[PDB]
Amino acid sequence: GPSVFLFPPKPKDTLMISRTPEVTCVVVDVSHEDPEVKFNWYVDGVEVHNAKTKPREEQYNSTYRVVSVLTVLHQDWLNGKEYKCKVSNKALPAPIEKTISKAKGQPREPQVYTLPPSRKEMTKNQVSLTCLVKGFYPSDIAVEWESNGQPENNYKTTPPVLKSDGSFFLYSKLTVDKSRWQQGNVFSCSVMHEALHNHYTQKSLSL
């Protein structure tokens, strides 16, 4: 019958106190005949009652997709409390239970370095500004670029790569006009990660 998938909140939502993180319990292959689903939610084995069901959606293979959403607290999440979804349905001999938590293990702090473009790059119209973020754990991170308090348009971040010491690294590349670089403009690399002080840090780069 139905299958259950449990999904974590977005990294930023857990890190920014001004945002609302949520775990999502997704039930697929719910039938046209027994469409009723009952969710039970537990936080470290203690039942909570604040979840809300999203509107039910019919798929093309004519099953329903049924979804319960639970608001979690930043620090509970960050402290690694366990969230359990219990799904009941008549097509189901017994209820299905899935459990989610933050990635297990001792967090490690992102070492963050800015790197100026190569001299050999000064030939081209555009130069590359490089932010190296390394030795972090877990891999939940956000990395953005800014100048004079404004987000920069043209940058790309590599996905996190697992190093052989068990931590992650990535690089973010900012592409700007040679002028802006050359005329002293200050650019900033911003990182969010649970293990940074205030989940934040900012490193700057200019000529």
Binding site: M16, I17, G149, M192, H197, N198, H199, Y200, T201
Partner: peptide
């Protein structure tokens, strides 16, 4: 000790 990100509040100790 508060960190802000583009005018948005991240975290205070």
């Amino acid at each position: 000790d508060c960190a802000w990100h583009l005018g948005e509040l991240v975290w205070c100790t």
